């Protein structure tokens, strides 16, 4: 009756806080267990594995996992979440003496610690001489989230975090655009709950 369970396809952690990704298994006999990571655009890399030796298994980069047979668990931890920990993690188990079976995966989202948020909506112009534009909602903290638009002619992306290494500076942003003649950046994010102090230039 062998399986491996990860719950939450997407999970969050605060930057600097304890990382904890849960995995449970169904096997009467203790199995071997594995944690793989997949950084975007790439293949799978082994972080660590339980192979019936040490119960506390240490892996690359501060990762560790404790095999706990009495609650059929093998949770992956790391003491502090860094922006570079953003990836998909897979728990996996040995099965039928002949193969590895994989959990469904959990993507870890790291919420940057934004101590001086400066929420704003900017208009950006095409570098080429159309008067085509996009709207950029930026510099809000992680209490803000962006909704998909009401209007099927207005396109709004998910929020994305960038890490400017030059200035050790992270920020959130979403982009909105439309081909409609009535479309203004003042209205682009009207379906999102934005900070009351959002800067709206000009």
């Amino acid at each position: 009756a062998q399986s491996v369970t990860q719950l939450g396809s997407h999970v969050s952690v605060s930057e600097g806080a304890l990382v904890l990704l849960r995995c449970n298994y169904s096997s009467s006999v203790p199995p071997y267990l594995f944690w793989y990571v997949q950084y975007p655009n790439q293949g799978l890399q082994l972080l660590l594995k339980y192979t019936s030796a040490a119960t506390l298994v240490k892996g690359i980069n501060g990762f560790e996992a404790e095999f706990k047979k009495s609650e059929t668990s093998f949770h992956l931890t790391k003491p502090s979440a860094h922006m570079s920990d953003a990836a998909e993690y897979f728990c996996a188990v040995s099965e039928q003496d002949d193969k590895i079976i994989f959990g469904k995966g959990t993507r870890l989202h790291i919420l940057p610690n934004i101590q001086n948020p400066d929420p704003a909506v900017y208009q950006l112009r095409d570098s080429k001489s159309s008067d085509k534009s996009v709207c950029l909602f930026t510099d809000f903290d992680s209490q803000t989230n962006v909704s998909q638009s009401k209007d099927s002619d207005v396109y709004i992306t998910d929020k994305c975090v960038l890490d400017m290494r030059s200035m050790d500076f992270k920020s959130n942003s979403a982009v909105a655009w439309s081909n409609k003649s009535d479309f203004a950046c003042a209205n682009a994010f009207n379906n999102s709950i934005i900070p009351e102090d959002t800067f709206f230039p000009s």
Partner: protein, 240 residues
């Protein structure tokens, strides 16, 4: 071993027989073919313990395999259908669960090759209001009107690929979500200090690698044949 897979990327029409090949140098008895889909992890299609041994995994329907040699394990889509679009991974194992994975095959099955379309790409220049408010400058790249959803976006500053300051949407959106063959669009941001954007010597390019038709595909439309290609857009730094 060095476990290697071919091809790395492929686009096909529905109804074609498609072959993926895994090769290894270490001669491990055990070889495996898996597929990866978002939300489902890696699902086993077929596996083989030697040249005389083939075993079904959980999702073997629509596929066949052959173990032609100790070194090689072939996967076939017998008659490709769109829901076989996936990242495919082969693996080998020793006798103690020491897995080596290949680097992946990204396969896209499309119903109608006539709908294939490269992106249009534009760069949007930083706002003066952002510059004055923050002393930073955010460029936005937009890739639009592409099909299928099989691209790679990068940023290039004075001719070198940059990763710092960048965030690209993890998945493109559908331009017409009610359509099964909607075109897609994708955005990315690159943020620099205002002083770096303000230097007219700095050159910024968004590059999109599109995967589409090959040379041997027939093309009957007047519009450009939508072959695998790169489409970029650019902007120069500006003192005003």
């Amino acid at each position: 071993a060095d476990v290697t897979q071919t091809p790395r990327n492929r686009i096909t029409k529905t109804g074609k027989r498609i072959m993926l090949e895994c090769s290894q140098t270490k001669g491990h008895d055990r070889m495996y073919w898996y597929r990866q889909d978002p939300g489902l992890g890696l699902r086993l299609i077929y596996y083989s313990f030697d040249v005389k041994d083939i075993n079904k995994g959980e999702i073997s329907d629509g596929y066949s395999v052959s173990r032609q040699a100790q070194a090689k394990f072939s996967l076939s889509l017998e008659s490709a259908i769109p829901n076989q679009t996936a990242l495919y991974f082969c693996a080998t194992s020793d006798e103690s669960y020491g897995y080596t994975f290949g680097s992946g095959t990204r396969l896209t099955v499309v119903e109608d090759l006539n709908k294939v379309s490269p992106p249009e790409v534009a760069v949007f220049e930083p706002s003066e209001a952002e510059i004055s408010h923050t002393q930073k400058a955010t460029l936005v790249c937009l890739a639009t009107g592409f099909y299928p959803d099989h691209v790679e976006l990068s940023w290039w500053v004075n001719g070198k690929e940059v990763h710092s300051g960048v965030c690209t949407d993890p998945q493109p959106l559908k331009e017409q979500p009610a359509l099964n063959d909607s075109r897609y669009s994708l955005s990315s941001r690159l943020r620099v200090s205002a002083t770096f954007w303000q230097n007219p010597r700095n050159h910024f390019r968004c590059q999109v690698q599109f995967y589409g038709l090959s040379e041997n595909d027939e093309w009957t439309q007047d519009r450009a044949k939508p072959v695998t290609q790169i489409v970029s857009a650019e902007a120069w730094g500006r003192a005003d």
